[PDB]
Design a binder for this molecule. Structure first.
Ligand SMILES: Cc1cncc(C(=O)N2C[C@H]3CC[C@@H](C2)N3[C@@H](c2cccc(F)c2)c2cn(CCc3ccsc3)nn2)c1
Ligand SMILES: [Cl-]
Ligand SMILES: [Mg+2]
Lengths: 300, 302
């Protein structure tokens, strides 16, 4: 029993983190095979990054894997990520893929400083394409990932903090999540919305763990609920979301539209001094799979 | 900016998790140098578990009865000993991935990271606190016995918890790595219950300081309090007493923020009296007590 915000074991990624220093800036890079990936804004000196990089020589890039130093033998740019070719293939390179995640999906973040891992936590790609992480100066290049079996799927590289304190980054191919640029300009997180399918998944997690007070005899329609959803700044619930929740509906005897009626009442009446899984708010950073994985016991 | 329940990177502990099998029972062990540590109830049957005589049970075991598996490598047991409620299996191979480590017994309110493990394979990592009633609020399923809790300040792993069982209220109990249970619990199936829990006052105060550091001041007030008047109010909300040690420990965060410790206590008093009025603090609608003062400085400063 118990339900907790749980990150993937980070060992396979710790062995890939390195420190990258160009000019005055130091941040983190990801060492896979014979390439180090890091944010292109490490580029020394409204920037024209292709033009700034030609001035740079391989030996301007200091790369350290612990005490050991890696020799840069080439450099290239892919969107907002810089790729440093090094002389040595990382002997601890895991089986891995680069993937791009969708809003509402979760991943583990390995927060790093000076190439040394310092913490791991779970976070969701918000509908406004930010994440609510915990990053200080020097965390740029920290990465986000999921693990399926022995395969690490890298999905996020951290680039910047926005004025509201939330965070923005790219996939490992250098494409930003959301309408952001890697520049000193005026940028702001858009208005956010609540990830409806994830709230429902969390209510099923609560039921599985004995928290049942919010259940009621009623059910609703997808059309009726989604009108309540938009009213409360909740993402629309689609039939595909209903399908994904199928497993949990079968396991608990609570149909999704049966649970939507519960969520409707919670949105309209509050929780009246009660809590669900130790929270006084509705939590939307657990996916249906996160709830199945943790209420069943998958391992890596 | 931001403030999150942050676990330590788990790789140094992942390299130590093994599977231990006795009879029909399989659980997790911790492999450091040439020793595998696991809960001694791995030698029990469910019948034994009402009033097991562990000394009598262990003397009947042969080394080859213990099947220890590290990945796809079967380790061979060459001896065994029992220390309180932990079984120490001597193996013929030292773990080449053994980190710098220590065993530490922690006090209520301390936090640590838990590496949930099944059949010797890590599943996930999350942050826990030792509650005042010597339980933890974890996420543990059947087969999680032997999972460990740890901290990694500098590059040394301090092991502080090994998971043994789940109590009737859904909370969890275990030992330190010397085999001594936290709290009054025993590794028997006899009736046992967690005591009434209380809120870890010093940690709430640390978290409120974290909130100020992150730029939130809505809960401050113009009042102060004596330490004794604070504790008279706090105990009425089932909060732990705040000691002069707790006040000393908060000195650094007080200095950084410019808010005296007893002024922050006055703010907490008001929050307990009023609630949040539909507001949040660091994204929570409740007062969070599983961040220590040391945690706050670690995450908000370095
Ligand atoms: C939800 C959960 C959370 N954390 C840990 C668990 C989890 O796996 N066990 C913990 C619990 C509950 C089941 C079992 C193992 N118990 C063992 C137990 C019971 C009472 C006190 C105690 F100190 C330990 C236990 C071990 N044996 C021997 C025969 C046997 C072996 C495997 S099943 C039966 N008999 N009882 C479960
Ligand atoms: Cl302690
Ligand atoms: Mg209903």
């Amino acid at each position: 029993s118990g339900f907790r915000k749980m990150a993937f074991p980070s060992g396979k990624v710790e062995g890939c983190m390195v420190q990258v220093t160009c000019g005055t800036t130091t941040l983190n890079g990801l060492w896979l095979d014979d390439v180090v990936y890091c944010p292109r804004h490490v580029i020394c000196t409204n920037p024209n990054y292709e033009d700034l990089l030609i001035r740079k020589s391989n030996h301007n890039f200091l790369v350290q894997a612990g005490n050991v130093q890696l020799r840069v033998i080439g450099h290239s740019m892919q969107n907002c990520v810089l790729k440093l070719k090094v002389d040595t293939a990382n002997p601890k390179t895991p089986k891995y893929k680069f993937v791009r995640i969708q809003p509402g999906q979760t991943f583990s973040v390995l927060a790093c400083y000076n190439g040394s891992p310092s913490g791991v936590y779970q976070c969701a790609m918000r509908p406004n394409f930010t994440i609510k992480g915990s990053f200080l100066n020097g965390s740029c290049g920290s990465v986000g990932f999921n693990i399926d079996y022995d395969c690490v799927s890298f999905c996020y590289m951290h680039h910047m903090e926005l004025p509201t304190g939330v965070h923005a980054g790219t996939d490992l191919e250098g494409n930003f999540y959301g309408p952001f640029v890697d520049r000193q300009t005026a940028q702001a997180a858009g208005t956010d919305t609540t990830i409806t399918v994830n709230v429902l998944a969390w209510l099923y997690a609560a039921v599985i763990n004995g928290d049942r007070w919010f259940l009621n005899r009623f059910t609703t329609t997808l059309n009726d609920f989604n009108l309540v959803a938009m009213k409360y700044n909740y993402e629309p619930l689609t039939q595909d979301h209903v399908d994904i929740l199928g497993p949990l509906s079968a396991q608990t005897g609570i149909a999704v539209l049966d649970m939507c009626a519960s969520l409707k009442e919670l949105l309209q009446n509050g929780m009246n001094g009660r809590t669900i899984l130790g929270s006084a708010l509705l939590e939307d950073e657990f996916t249906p799979f996160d709830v199945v994985r943790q209420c069943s016991g998958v391992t890596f």
